[PDB]
Amino acid sequence: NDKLVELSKSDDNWVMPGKNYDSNNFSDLKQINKGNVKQLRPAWTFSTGLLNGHEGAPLVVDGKMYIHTSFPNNTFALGLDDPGTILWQDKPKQNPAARAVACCDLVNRGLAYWPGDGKTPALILKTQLDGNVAALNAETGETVWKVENSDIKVGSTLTIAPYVVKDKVIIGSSGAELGVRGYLTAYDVKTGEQVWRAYATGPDKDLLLASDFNIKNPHYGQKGLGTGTWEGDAWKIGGGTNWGWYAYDPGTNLIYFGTGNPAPWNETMRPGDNKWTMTIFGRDADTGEAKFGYQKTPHDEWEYAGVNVMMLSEQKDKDGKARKLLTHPDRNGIVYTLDRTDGALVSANKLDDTVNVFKSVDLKTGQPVRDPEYGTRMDHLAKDICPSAMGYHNQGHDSYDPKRELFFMGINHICMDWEPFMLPYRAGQFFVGATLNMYPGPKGDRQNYEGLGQIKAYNAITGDYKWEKMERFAVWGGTMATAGDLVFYGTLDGYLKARDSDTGDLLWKFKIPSGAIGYPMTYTHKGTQYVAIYYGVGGWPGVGLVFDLADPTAGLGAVGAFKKLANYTQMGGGVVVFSLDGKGPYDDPNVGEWK
């Protein structure tokens, strides 16, 4: 969408998840920099009135901030000139039954925005846990249109954020833990009319493949694998849902995203590669057809849902060739980097050297070399597998410094024990079939259950890690970087941290109300630069804390892994905005007063 592209070039805007179509989460603003960060302080705050995990980040467009919350997914609009006054609010009424079919806490990654043409006004697009997708009038908040995308009666819910490309909205899908066959849909932003819908498994017809799909990398596989790599109708409940993030290149007109884990978790019941879940896709924005597809984890047996963030860039490869790339830190512990024009593998390195599920990833066959010693299977107990189902990198949205050519990623250091079990499939009921036990990785304190995370600076071409740092808990919600030589990010134990982009030294941090599982964002308003971030621990890692679970194997094993989380934080829900010296709207105490 060219207004969006234009708008995203503005520093007092943040018009889409990931800031821009490259989704680098990078700001050219250098007002707040490593020289003055130690003066960063809260300018104002806003409680959303809800508990549970608060993922994503707010949007700032045309002097207004749009805030989204966890279930029941409310939407608020604040005037940057007087944030204490809620311009309008949308409070959906949803079937409380949706709560029962949500695997990993009642979260939502964010709102999208469409500029408007003329006949139609600017719109705020949102998704609801219950499956509805709605378009709200950006200025009044009234509903322009609302349609059904996912049906909870079958286990399908929605947590992903919408994505606006040209004049269409892209909606993902969630539910693999309940055997939901994945599919992403494109709607007409103006009317809610369905343009195209592609599935992750089954007949090529449902897959919506371009006639030249993977023509440049025939070994990735091509026609017939949607059913070929499955036994019988198994694919019908094969999973592959996409609930992560997207990236877009106007040049190729391709939408870049990854599909999720196949169902069930029980490896033994899914003989075959399970094309096409766990795969990096290149789809044409308008037609929906896939031009290339590389499967990261053939026949998954760890739940390495391959939906993680896509970050685009342009760099020279080891041959000095300029390449249009896409970097992808997957759940399986490998950071993939492909040519975003034909899908060629450029590099696939381990996030951490403790990764042991794969010996390596053969760049010329594209297949990952499996170390049998760590696979899973019926009637067996696999131990000390890394990464765990939570992966060495999850839902967090990282960032990339175009100048340094460095990706700052929020890593997970968690391994697991695993043993599957048989179970029937009943639409509407969980279809996991595996009991896990997770704990800190080799570099963490396995005794006191701490040292579950890390943050590193990485180069996709060299594969070198400029620097690495250990975090008490997994760095779950992503990072953001500015030209001020800073890298900001929130932590589960309830901090907003800033590190030197070059050395990784911790320069500053603040104690926010609750753990952070979303990414920071920054904007300027009337000359002042602000940094905002949501607070409210939750998501998979906070499951035990949220639903008050004690059994270490509860919450699909997550509970045990974060047993110490409750000594550093409690639930919460809101936004904290920082500015140099806390400068803000109310510096003149009379603004907002009653006269």
Partner: protein, 72 residues
């Protein structure tokens, strides 16, 4: 099984030592009920059907109505 040898492009799955090449009729047969396996598909073409009505009506009247029951 280390994923290195492939029956064909994009197809490299092999059974692990001691497991059938086809779980059909084996100890590990899911025995899935096709009645169940098809619930999702119907769910979608009903949702698409309703949305079709909602959208068309909106185009027609210029007024959006979510309750299909109230659409004529």
């Amino acid at each position: 099984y280390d994923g290195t040898k492939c029956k064909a492009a994009g197809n490299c799955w092999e059974p692990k030592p001691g497991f059938p090449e086809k779980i059909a009729g084996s100890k590990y047969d899911p025995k899935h009920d096709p009645k169940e396996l098809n619930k999702q598909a119907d769910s979608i073409k009903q949702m698409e059907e309703r949305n079709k009505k909602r959208v068309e009506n909106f185009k027609k009247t210029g007024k959006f109505e979510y309750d299909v029951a109230k659409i004529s």
